[PDB]
Amino acid sequence: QMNYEEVIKKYRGEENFDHAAYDWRLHSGVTPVKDQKNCGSCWAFSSIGSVESQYAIRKNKLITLSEQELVDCSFKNYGCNGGLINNAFEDMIELGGICPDGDYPYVSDAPNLCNIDRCTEKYGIKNYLSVPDNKLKEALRFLGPISISVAVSDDFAFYKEGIFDGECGDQLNHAVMLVGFGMKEIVNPLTKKGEKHYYYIIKNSWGQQWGERGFINIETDESGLMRKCGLGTDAFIPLIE
């Protein structure tokens, strides 16, 4: 809901940057991964997560917000039955902030009315930008983690570690967040020596006991244009400033 290039300038400028790697996780920009459990709330978890990061970064504050308040009050979405990232940010603005993870605990699929009053300190967002299907790493590098969508194939769930590059799903069927990229330099199971494998770093919402501490690495190229499984097809990053 804004013009990227217009904002990317206010944060980057002429500063060049390393395209091989930047990890918001270890620079205090990624709050802990959560677990949506058996409720289809990925969208709420993804948007909330990107909001948590803007605070962790910009307003240098660690705060975890209620995905449950979104599942219960974002009407432009369908609670456990699904939703859309931007709709979430939308309703976030409509609601003028979300209660803390703490005053409004998550309860997954268990019926639950929406009570905006369950707290007094609502954390909100001034607005939210949509980042270009490309220029991802760029956004990621200066704006912060990004709520994105992806086609998750069945094997995506088995991912236990490494750099997943397996089969993808049918269509965009999940919201996760991009928190950075990196590049491990492997050798060569195919006869030679060195080689560079670049990857994006995803923060899932299936709890820590999944993939690398809840995070997963998806293949990509130095450029950050190779978006396996539809990565960031839909990509947004909220702004609290």
Neighbour-count burial of 161, counting CB atoms closer than 10 A to its CB (0-12 exposed, 13-18 middle, 19+ buried):
exposed
Q: How far does CA 154 lie from the centroid of its chain?
A: 20
Q: Cα torsion for 187, 188, 191, 194, to the nearest 10°?
A: -40
Assess contact for 229 and 159: CB atoms under 8 A: no
Alpha-carbon distance 29 to 106, whole Å?
22
Please tell me the experimental approach by which this structure was elucidated. Answer: X-ray
How do strand 195-203 and strand 215-220 relate by DSSP bridges?
Answer: antiparallel
Neighbour-count burial of 133, counting CB atoms closer than 10 A to its CB (0-12 exposed, 13-18 middle, 19+ buried):
middle
Active site residues: 42, 174, 204
Read out DSSP for 68-136?
HHHHHH-TTTTTTB---HHHHHHHHHHHTSB-BTTTS---TTS-----TTS-S--B--SEEEE--SSSH
Assess contact for 228 and 168: CB atoms under 8 A: yes
Alpha-carbon distance 70 to 78, whole Å?
10
Give the resolution value in Å: 3.1
Assess contact for 22 and 57: CB atoms under 8 A: no
The topology (CATH level 3) of 1-241 is: Cathepsin B; Chain A (3.90.70)
